[model samples]
Target: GSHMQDPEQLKHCNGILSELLSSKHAAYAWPFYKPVDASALGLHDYHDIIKHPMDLSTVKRKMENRDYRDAQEFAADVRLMFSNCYKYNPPDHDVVAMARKLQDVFEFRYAKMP
Candidate 1:
C-alpha cells in the first residue's frame, strides 16, 4: 500500500496548478490569446514599446516549447517580464502631489486643448 507522495513533489504539483489557474496562464492556454492595449489605457509614451505575440498558433507553439522547472520559476519569469517591460521612468509621490496642487487651483471650464 502506498500512502505518501514526496513533499517537494506535492509542492511542485500545487505550484503548477496555481499557475494553470492564473489569468496570465489562462491567456496562454486554449485559444491562447489575450488582447492588451497600452494606448487604450493612456500609456501614450509606451504604446509602441509593448507588444502582443504574433498570433494564437505561434504563441501556443512557443509556450509549449518552453520549459519551466516549477510554478515558482514560471511566476518569477512572468514577474520579471512585466517589471522589465514597465520600468520606464515612473512618477513618484512628489509628482503626483504637484499634479494635484495644479489641478486643485486650475479651472477646467476653459481648457486650452478643447
Candidate 2:
C-alpha cells in the first residue's frame, strides 16, 4: 500500500497561499503609495506606470501587452528611491526620519492638491 502525500509539500503550499493573499493586499495598497512626481529622478508622469494585471489568473496575459515606456519609468523611480533611501536607511534607525521628511513635503504641504 502507498503512503499519503509528504507533509513538506503541504507546508510549502500554505506559504504560497499566504504570499498570494499578501499580493492581493499589495494590489490594493499600490494606489495609496502612488508617486506624486518622478521628476526629481528626471522621470515624468510616473503614476500608473506599471499596470498590475487586474485578473487573478493567466500570468502571460497580464505581462504581455505592457507599455514599455511606463514600465521603464517605474523602474527608474524605484532605482532613484533606493539611491535616496540608501543614504537615509529606512530599515535602520532613520525610518521615521524619512517618513517625516516625506510627510512634510507630500502629505502636509499638498494636503489639498488633487
Candidate 3:
C-alpha cells in the first residue's frame, strides 16, 4: 500500500545519506551523527527551545523505513536538523559552521536528484 514512488529518487536519497554518514567528504558530521543529549551536554534548556530534535541516525531510520511521503519531506527533515542546530548554537559556534557546510552539500546533491 504505497503511492507511486520514484525508485531513482529513493536511490539518490540513499546515496546522499551514505555520504553524510561517512567522513570521506569531511563535512564535520561527527557532532550531529547521533541525537543530542541535553543532560550530558549541560544544555538543560535545549528541549525547551528546540522542540523537535533531529540527527542523521534518526533520518537514516526514517528513510530506511520509507516513512517520508516524498523527496521533499525527506529533504525537509534533513533541513530541520540543521535549522535546529542554528537555533540552539551561538553564531560563532563550531557546530553552526559545520551545519552550514553539510546543509550546503545536501542541497547541492539534492538539486540534481532524479
lDDT of the candidates, in the order given: 0.37, 0.34, 0.87
Model 1 per-residue lDDT tens digits across residues 5-95: 4334335434443443356444233221333344685767653554432323332333455444433443344333333233432555343
RMSD each, Å: 16.9, 15.4, 1.8
Off by over 4 Å in 3: 1-5
User: Whose TM-score is greatest here?
Assistant: 3
User: Tens-digit lDDT track for model 3 on 1-114?
Assistant: 344666667778889989988867565888779999899999999999999899999999998898865777788889999999999999799999889888888999999886
Clashing pairs for predicted structure model 1, backbone only = none
Instruction: Estimate the TM-score of every prediction.
Output: 0.29, 0.22, 0.91
lDDT measured at residue 41 in model 1 versus the true structure, 0 to 100: 53
By lDDT, the best candidate is 3
Candidate structures ordered by TM-score, highest first: 3, 1, 2
The TM-score that candidate 2 achieves is 0.22
Model 3 CA lDDT for position 25: 54
lDDT of 2 by residue, 1-114 (tens): 222442333333333323333544443322224333346755453434533312112211222333212222323333344344333334554533543343333323223222
Candidate 2 local lDDT, residue 38: 48
Ranking by lDDT: 3, 1, 2
